[PDB]
Design a protein around this nucleic acid. Structure first.
Lengths: 79, 99, 207, 125, 60, 127, 155
RNA sequence: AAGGAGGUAAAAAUGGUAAAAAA
RNA sequence: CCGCCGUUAGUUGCCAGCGGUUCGGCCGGGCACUCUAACGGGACUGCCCGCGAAAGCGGGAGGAAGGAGGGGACGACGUCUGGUCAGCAUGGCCCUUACGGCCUGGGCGACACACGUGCUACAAUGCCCACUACAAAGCGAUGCCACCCGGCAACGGGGAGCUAAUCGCAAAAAGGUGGGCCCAGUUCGGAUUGGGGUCUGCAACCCGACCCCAUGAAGCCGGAAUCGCUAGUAAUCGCGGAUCAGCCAUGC
């Protein structure tokens, strides 16, 4: 992916800074499952946008520098 | 010291030009470097038969453009004069370059 | 049941392009585009009196609006006026330097495009196919070819089953190279569908 | 010769003898071969114990092998079960971790094949 | 669809990696020879019609 | 004064110049025994001057480029067989039943479309 | 074809010795378009024979040829929904071909150390008479003999 | 060996597939 | 289109002729020779020996070229109620603030099988490392990029030349010359996979490619049956292009 820098929405930065400016209520409703789970996202509920619903994931650490929607399966039925 | 390049579409009027032009230069001047045959520029195209999904069975096609060269030694008034305007290549353009 | 384009077959020395100018790799595309739009605009809004050749000579800005038409008079204008607006429509849509041409062939039944054009015209106005078309083949053979194959496909009077109709007379060797065959295709369009009109006129050897 | 995990290669080029080891390829072979000193072309059997001991000293010190390595991988795999990242999601599914193909080919990341009954098709004649 | 597709290529979008070829004398994006700006069948028909310049019925 | 041979096979130009001598035969800048080192068809192409025994009595300049090495060798056979047929048209009449006059008829046929190797047809199915 | 009689077509008068059969055997050792190293291999083998024994290479070659000669080869006869398994007096051309090729695959069969070595040792035993291609020669002979009921059942 | 004809022995594992219709 | 020869042509070539040479056809000069591309010539059983009621036939000669000289583009009258209104047209039919447009993501990459076509393999004609040469074709101006430097590499920084037979892709591989490996799942095979970088592009999770360390699996030559191939053809081996930011290209 990226090499000199790292991709994440700028709106994710700017909206981290706000819900950090209050330590406010839960839910981040990203309408783009792209944007890396870059360090400063702590571990809050991510209702990432699938195409169907809003997959809500409680982030940990074992996932930091690796994409958000990289955690939503979307493709139903496995084997 | 005059280096003229022939850029054309068909060898026919291409050499037909080259004949009179070189002679008219030999006419109103002196020695003229004969119409050298620069390797004819040809392009490659490969389409198929019909629109409907067939991959194999086809028809190939190719672009035909022709390149040549003419030089002289003296910038005579009369050569310049004639070999300037006196032209009708219709569908052929050329390049004047110096050396 | 094919027939590789007899005109695309003629490409040797038996049919010169309908566009001879210099195109240098780059500008060549836009040249082809602009020019094709000229052609296309002509073909309809210049129809009136039927043309074959859509030839154009160009180079640097210079344009040659060259046409082979089956009539010049009632397509040049009552005072050389039809040439005016049209030529300047070209010039307006192709801002450079336009130069009209209305060369005329003294024979209609010679030259397949327009022959087929009339052939399609008759059926377009709902005429009995086989009769009139076969006798049109006979018209062309009252003019003087060595062969004329004017086939006509599509819906024949409707009846769903759109076949193809056999009309011809005299030998036609479109396989042969030095045969010099003008071939012309006319689009037949009935209010009940689309029919095809192919004319094949064979001229002569030693040319 | 148990330098690495009970690793005993025997009479051959020291390079191949060193490559017969987990966590040590041919590149790593010539690498430690230039860092410990020992000559590649010369056999590993007819060696001299001093250069040998200092060699194995350099070996395990600057890099590590099978023990931690595969265990470390499996721990990153525990993370690949942490919330089950798509990587580890499919790695749990017993399927390729890449995003390749599963319509047909999957004969190594998964086993061979598990026979069914086809389910047939639509007209082909 | 089809009409808006031409406008999409006509207007030319924001980022570079969004453009796509288009046979202007037929209207198609895939396999459009970006020398003539024409598709495969567009190209074929225009050549056979005794219209395509430079090129010839290749028989090498 | 010079013995020249136009040597061509599967497109490769063996420009063959000749003066008399012993065995000085330089192929495009190098001796024969390196510019075609290892290849066994090399010595075979030395046949023409061997079957006329005048292999010695020559000091060659052999410029040879294009196509392929072995092809160049065959092209050298042709260049020789054309160089001597020049300065003694008597060798000519006897050299034809050996074939040292024929050039070639075996060039790489064009990649035929519809098949892989110009004739090699792809696999059939049906079932 | 069915109008023609095809051909055999002259091979190559050996790029060295000066004999068709040498470069024929070379032609069958040949690694599909790589006559280069295969011919090289065969020749290394030859000169190695001439460094082992004393008998001539072309001589022992003719001995390979003869010592493996399928004088009569087995085939099959015409009789509708059945075929008689029928041997027949072969031609010297087809015998030579079969032969040399059997020496070829017998040379391939040996699990030795190198190509030249293989072809060599193979040629030693097989020219002598204690080889595999020879075993199949004698074999097809036994087959032809046991099928002497199919003597006038030759197509 | 030519045809043509006259009396004797040969050779198909299986196959269901409709229909007002178009000239 | 392609092999032999002919006329013209000379910033590709060229000492073949001569002068010099940091000894490079680099510095002058020629067009014969390579060559490049237009008009040509040449082969017809024309001729020699015999056979056949003829066609035709064997053999032989001159020939670059022998009896159809090699490959192409050429595909009738017409069968298939073959396919495609989803490239394009065009009869009807239906919908019409939606069966129309945008945008955003997800997706057409799913996996329990089956099959078609293809790649590299299982290997000592072998693979690995070293060294030196002969390609035709095509492509290339916000493209080709030589070049030097940077980095283990990916690739990046500075930076000559070209709308090109005159600058570059470009490193051909096979061959060949020197050493290893020494019959072992082997230094054979690169599949799985993690560990980190770059490059693309707004942005690479599902979804790019490239590189560096490592894991180094299956696989020890494939039965019922079947693919292609008659001469520069099999096979082997490499190369350019179309579309392209990129690349799923083992495709064409």
């Amino acid at each position: 992916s990226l090499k000199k820098g790292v991709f994440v929405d700028d709106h994710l930065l700017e909206k981290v800074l706000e819900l950090n400016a209050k330590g406010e209520k839960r839910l981040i409703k990203t309408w783009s499952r792209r944007s890396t789970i870059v360090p400063e996202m702590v571990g809050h509920t991510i209702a990432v946008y699938n195409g169907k619903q809003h997959v809500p994931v409680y982030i940990t650490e074992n996932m930091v520098g690796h994409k958000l929607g990289e955690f939503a399966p979307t493709r139903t039925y496995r084997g | 010291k005059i280096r003229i390049k022939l850029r054309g579409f068909d060898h026919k009027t291409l050499d037909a030009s080259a004949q009179k032009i070189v002679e008219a230069a030999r006419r109103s001047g002196a020695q003229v470097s004969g119409p050298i045959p620069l390797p004819t520029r040809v392009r490659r195209f490969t389409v198929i038969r019909g629109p409907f999904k067939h991959k194999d069975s086809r028809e190939h096609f190719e672009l035909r453009t022709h390149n040549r060269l003419v030089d002289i030694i003296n910038p005579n008034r009369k050569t310049i004069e004639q070999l300037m305007t006196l032209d009708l290549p219709t569908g052929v353009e050329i390049e004047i370059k110096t050396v | 049941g094919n027939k590789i384009h007899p005109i695309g077959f003629r490409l040797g020395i038996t049919r010169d392009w309908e566009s001879r100018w210099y195109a240098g790799k780059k500008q060549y595309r836009h040249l082809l585009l602009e020019d094709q739009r000229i052609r296309g605009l002509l073909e309809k809004e210049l129809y009136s009196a039927g043309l074959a050749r859509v030839d154009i000579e160009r180079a640097a800005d210079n344009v040659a609006v060259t046409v082979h038409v089956a009539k010049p008079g009632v397509v040049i204008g009552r005072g050389g006026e039809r040439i005016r607006v049209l030529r300047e429509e070209l010039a307006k849509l192709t801002g450079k330097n336009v130069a009209l041409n209305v060369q005329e062939v003294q024979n209609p039944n010679l030259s397949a495009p327009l022959v087929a054009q009339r052939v399609a015209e008759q059926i377009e106005r709902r005429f009995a196919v086989r009769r009139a078309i076969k006798q049109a083949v006979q018209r062309v053979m009252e003019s003087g070819a060595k062969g004329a194959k004017v086939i006509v496909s599509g819906r024949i009077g409707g009846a769903e089953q759109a076949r193809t109709e056999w009309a011809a007379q005299g030998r036609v060797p479109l396989h042969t190279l030095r045969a010099n065959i003008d071939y012309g295709f006319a689009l037949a369009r009935t209010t009940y569908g689309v029919l095809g009109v192919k004319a094949y006129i064979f001229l002569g050897e030693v040319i | 010769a148990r330098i690495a995990g009970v690793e005993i290669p025997r009479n051959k080029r020291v390079d191949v003898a060193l490559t017969y080891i987990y966590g040590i390829g041919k590149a790593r072979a010539k690498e430690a071969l230039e860092k410990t000193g020992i000559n590649p072309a010369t056999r590993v059997k007819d060696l001299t114990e001093a250069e040998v001991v200092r060699l194995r000293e350099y070996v395990e010190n600057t890099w590590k092998l099978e023990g931690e390595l595969r265990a470390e991988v499996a721990a990153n795999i525990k993370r690949l079960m942490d919330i089950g990242c798509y990587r580890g999601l499919r790695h749990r599914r017993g399927l390729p971790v890449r995003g390749q193909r599963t319509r047909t080919n999957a004969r190594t990341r998964k086993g061979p094949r598990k026979t069914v009954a086809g389910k047939k098709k639509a007209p082909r004649k | 669809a089809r009409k808006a597709l031409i406008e999409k290529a006509k207007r030319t979008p924001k980022f570079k990696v969004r453009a796509y070829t288009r046979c202007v004398r037929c209207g198609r994006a895939r396999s459009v020879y970006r020398f003539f700006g024409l598709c495969r069948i567009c190209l074929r028909e225009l050549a056979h019609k005794g219209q395509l310049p430079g090129v010839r019925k290749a028989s090498w | 004064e010079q013995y020249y041979g136009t040597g061509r096979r599967k497109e490769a130009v063996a420009r063959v110049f000749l003066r008399p001598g012993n065995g000085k035969v330089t192929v495009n800048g190098q001796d024969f025994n390196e510019y075609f080192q290892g290849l066994v068809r090399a010595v075979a192409a030395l046949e023409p001057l061997r079957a006329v025994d005048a292999l010695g009595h020559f000091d060659a300049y052999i410029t040879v480029r294009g196509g392929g090495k072995s092809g160049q060798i065959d092209a050298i056979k042709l260049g020789i067989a054309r160089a001597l047929v020049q300065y003694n048209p008597d060798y000519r009449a006897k050299l034809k039943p050996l074939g040292f006059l024929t050039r070639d008829a075996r060039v790489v046929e064009r990649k035929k479309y519809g098949k892989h190797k110009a004739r090699r047809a792809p696999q059939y199915s049906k079932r | 074809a069915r109008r023609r009689r095809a051909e055999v077509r002259q091979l190559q008068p050996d790029l060295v010795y000066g004999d068709v059969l040498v470069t024929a055997f070379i032609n069958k050792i040949m690694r599909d378009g790589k006559k280069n190293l295969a011919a090289r291999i065969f020749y290394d083998a030859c000169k190695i024979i001439q460094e082992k024994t004393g008998q001539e290479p072309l001589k022992v070659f003719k001995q390979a040829v003869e010592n493996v000669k399928p004088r009569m080869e087995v085939r099959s006869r015409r009789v509708g929904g059945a075929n008689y398994q029928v041997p027949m007096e072969v031609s010297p051309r087809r015998q030579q071909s079969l032969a040399l090729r059997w020496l070829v695959q017998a040379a391939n069969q040996r699990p030795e150390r190198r190509a030249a070595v293989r072809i060599a040792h193979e040629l030693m035993d097989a020219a002598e008479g204690k080889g595999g291609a020879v075993k199949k020669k004698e074999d097809v002979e036994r087959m032809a003999e046991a099928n002497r009921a199919y003597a006038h059942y030759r197509w």
